[PDB]
Symmetry: D3
Subunit: 237 residues, 6 copies
């Protein structure tokens, strides 16, 4: 077992899908996995294991923020033999040509955190995903008919930022969406030698919030998950 | 109803106790509060409100990490009329003469996070707790005949630090315990004008690696809740 | 005899009061201490030792600035057996509801200096005062029927700041007063294991530019000394 | 005509290859481009424009360092309508498994430079290449049966770094090759909305170097240019 | 008058010599000035005005540290019409080929303070003296027979440094001596448009402290002062 | 033979002039040096060695930017026994009184680069020229009846700075000219114990530029080289 995960070696697949919300991790195991079993529930951070089209897959929440997801991804990679981590979450839009319900894939992730400077002797560590995972994700989305955008994400430490003028900067350097974990997970993946990726759906538009209809918002979230799950099979081949 | 809290103005008391563990909030509600009802469950971040010796009080977890508890403490303060926040969590010991199960009262909190530098034009902001609350707790402890060291805590962004040499520095400066939220909570309290205090139970020792055990886990965590609840009454006097 | 203090082990009491003004130390020795003798005059940094209501106490200025008071507090602590240090100085007000002659008790001290970042591996060190001393003073004040706000001070390196916009930031965060030594003294106290507290008399207002006047200068500065001297006795009880 | 480029709008193609040595721009124009024509000579920075299998292509050296390549790539993007920039050159390996003559593609570029911090409000900007250009280069290499590795690069400001342990860090974080431009080129592209890529060949292994001949070394170089050239065409579809 | 200087326009010469110690400023007025009058004594920081070989000159202490000397030099330049400031003090040796009783002139001054970064938007401001003053000083020392060294000084914030390994760095980059004000005065001079210079005599050798004989040490301090005073006359011509 | 300089020890004189444009190294060798002989061609960085009035002198371009000039000046100092380095070039004025064609001598060089911070433990290193070389250049100019100004220069990493108010700061602190090498050359000299100087001519006034002819512009340039050349001889005594 582990300080934050009460399970044993074998309980998880070598691939773990991670939503920020635990209740959302249960929703995924319910909707897409066959024969899903709960493998952890410490602090209410639900984790499940099952199979998709015959492939052993796991899904577990990682909580909000870099400090939170860092603890979990680290314990999985170094104590449960996990090799891949695909974060499937939500992000806010900054660029105008980016619309609600757009699937974005973070090849890289900018940040206002200090975690990577701490690991990188205070220089700039470019937090990036695994190239193959990005490609698998891009090819799966195409098969499903979705036109995914691949670029930079911004991982913020303050959801309720004091500044706000930093949003002008993000849009200027082409940031595709803002969330809160990418840069942290990538930093962890680099540190312990595993592979990670982050896919997001635009939850709202910083510029002008607002959304469409629940039915459509939920269809796009499912499209994202199918791309995540399908990209894995694709990577097995 | 806020982005992460599904409740209406009135569901929460003007005073909230906050453990990182959602399940611990529930354990507290079931053991110390009377006629307590659940006011939140969004993202499983369970919140409760009942009464303690007549007084109305609430308890809700904040998850792990500064960015996590920042969101929660901020929404309660600006959309639910919360005036006091008392985090009740666990920490790691760095000093030899600091035992497991020990109770520490953070008058201040150091940190390796950037949230505060972003707020204070990159200068050093002394994240300190509210004085009266620090005193109410010190008294509540003396009345309960319980021990409690008052001092500096260290709010870390990385539970699994890549720089262990920083623990000597933490020790050299007498840091009582290592947790992950204090400096963030104290930062937000100041930003939105509120009062906060952090109380912690030494759950483990960083040098000796000794992790909690026996039924001395709960009980010790029962004194921490005792002191917090009682320190509120003194504050009401 | 240290590099900047010409005295021998024993000349100083275990408790020293320290104003920035050397002449003020002398005024204090002549008005509050009994059978006081001069123990230092190197660089004109006058030091005195006498008794107050039976207790042996010393008073010596520290000059202006963190680097200045750092030298002095460090030599007293390591070569004269000093255990407590209580700075008694003046500060500038930033908040509207903070009047001239007001007494502030620095529980913490923010800063734009680098001395602490150099000590804390470039992280945020919460420079806080010793808790019991903060309490002894708050009581000494209540007994004297004197008012005294307890909170954060701001230790500036530049009295004539080139960035006045930082005062809004200081205000926004409720900084009680602007002085130039607190964070340095609290830093040294921690480094060489000692206890310190800073008490200040609002000598001017940064917004209104109102500078002290009338015979209300001295007297107000007489309450500050009163509280300090008395807070020591309480601490002896 | 820009300050450093004496030529008119239309002289350069929408795509430009950039070697370090300006002498290399000539070799490429003569060894690979059809109907070539010099288009710049300022400061000796030789630049040509020709065609590769019907596709108009330009080639021009950029000098050593981020400050240099930054002015060139900027003027081209803002004053000659350049849409894509492919940098070709050499780098030093730090990983044991990365061998001399290995081809490396910088999907991302770390750096010890401050240019991006100055651009991104002193936060962490992830300098990444354009995903499609990356994928094109990989596919094109596969076509030529060459083995290309996709990862992080490190843009050092000092070819002679007074610091040595920094190479240990780079290794620990899987840096593929060390060079001096990628991070600067990526920041500019992001700044003025253009696409860029960096492809390198391991010239030296810093740690342990073998012995490459000028014969082998030109083959690898020509292999890199074919990869860069064929990738454009794929990019074209 | 001024907050720290109780004098009036006209009381000081347009040239001010400033030793760190006030008692030393009186020693200078006594030994080298004709018809010297005390023009300030606030906080015991003695200031004098008189003439040398018919030239009106002033001399006043500036206290220890950048925060201290910054307040005084600023008040003199902007409230008492001072145009030149020559700091005459003591410094510690770092380079072996630098011997006790060597007169060093700081053309520039490195620092561990954060004052200049605050004035210079966080970049590197090279704190330097006025070229003519450096030359006058160099020519005067020659007339007197002294062989002055002209180079860099290091202005420290912590006289009792936590590090100490920074001394290896200073010697490596050729620092001539370490004191505590130069960088601050130069920053002030640049900010308010006046001219400043710093001359120092090696008080000891960090490498191996120790000194010669009082008679010789005091002869060299007087040589320094004569160079300071003589350089002024030289500058008048 | 160094990585960037294909030549042997003895090929370069103890003194080397360095222009930005490598084409300029040729013009100087032919227009001013006797018995000139090319000594390097790598990457097109042309370098020559001849004599000026019996004095052996070398000339070679260094490229644009601190990262570039840093490798060249380093290899020369450590591998060809170069004792002094004089950089000659142009810069942009930011002060109103500094006119086009004005000659400027950088006694110091500010910068927005991180190279010196990386070298000096993240503290402020004052990048200064060698005082005697500075004085020689001034005297030599006077001889040629030219008006030279001695002050601070600013070494910008980005010729196209996204930040604009930074020019206001530079003006406020009396910066004389903006360029891109001085601070890097000075850091290297300090690092390997050598002497260096930078002399510039105002080419543009950034703010308001007039109209200089290629006729006038060459005269100023030749005036600068005579100053640089005559100063060496004075340096020789
Ligand atoms: N504009 C935004 N700023 C910060 N986090 C955001 C934003 N939009 C969506 N998120 C993400 O969604 C959650 C908060 O609602 C977090 O998990 C965070 O990653
Ligand atoms: N040794 C430790 N280091 C850091 N955080 C700790 C430690 N022990 C307990 N914690 C706390 O518990 C959680 C991490 O397990 C966080 O909420 C943090 O406050
Ligand atoms: N407005 C102010 N700003 C900064 N320091 C002040 C101010 N007013 C009083 N002080 C204090 O008095 C001295 C400067 O006059 C320092 O010792 C400092 O603590
Ligand atoms: N080992 C290496 N370290 C740093 N830069 C290198 C190295 N090998 C090749 N280069 C590259 O070649 C040039 C320096 O010779 C620079 O343009 C740089 O990108
Ligand atoms: N080694 C040293 N470190 C710091 N300050 C020094 C040193 N040697 C001499 N000084 C100077 O002398 C005084 C302290 O004795 C201060 O004014 C300071 O400038
Ligand atoms: N206005 C200017 N700004 C920045 N660098 C300049 C300027 N004018 C001339 N230069 C110099 O000339 C080159 C850029 O054209 C660089 O080597 C730089 O030193």
């Amino acid at each position: 077992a582990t300080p934050h995960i009460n399970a044993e070696m074998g309980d998880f697949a070598d691939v773990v899908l991670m939503p920020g919300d635990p209740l959302r991790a249960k929703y995924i195991a319910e909707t897409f996995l066959e024969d899903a079993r709960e493998v952890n529930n410490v602090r209410g951070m639900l984790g499940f294991t099952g199979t998709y089209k015959g492939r052993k897959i796991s899904v577990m929440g990682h909580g909000m923020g870099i400090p939170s997801c860092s603890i979990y991804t680290k314990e999985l990679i170094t104590d449960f033999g996990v090799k891949k981590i695909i974060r499937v979450g939500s992000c806010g839009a900054v660029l105008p040509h980016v619309k609600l319900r757009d699937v974005v894939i973070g090849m890289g992730a900018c940040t206002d955190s200090k975690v990577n400077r701490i690991r990188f002797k205070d220089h700039d560590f470019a937090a990036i995903a695994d190239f193959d995972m990005v490609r698998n994700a891009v090819d799966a989305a195409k098969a499903l008919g979705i036109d995914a955008r691949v670029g930079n994400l911004f991982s913020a430490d303050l959801f309720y930022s004091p500044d706000g003028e930093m949003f002008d900067v993000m849009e200027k350097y082409g940031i595709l969406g803002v969330e809160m974990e990418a840069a942290g997970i990538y930093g962890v993946a680099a540190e312990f030698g595993a592979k990670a990726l982050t896919i997001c759906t635009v939850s709202d538009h910083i510029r002008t919030h607002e959304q469409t209809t629940a039915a459509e918002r939920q269809t796009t979230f499912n499209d994202m998950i199918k791309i995540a799950l399908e990209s894995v099979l694709l990577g097995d081949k």
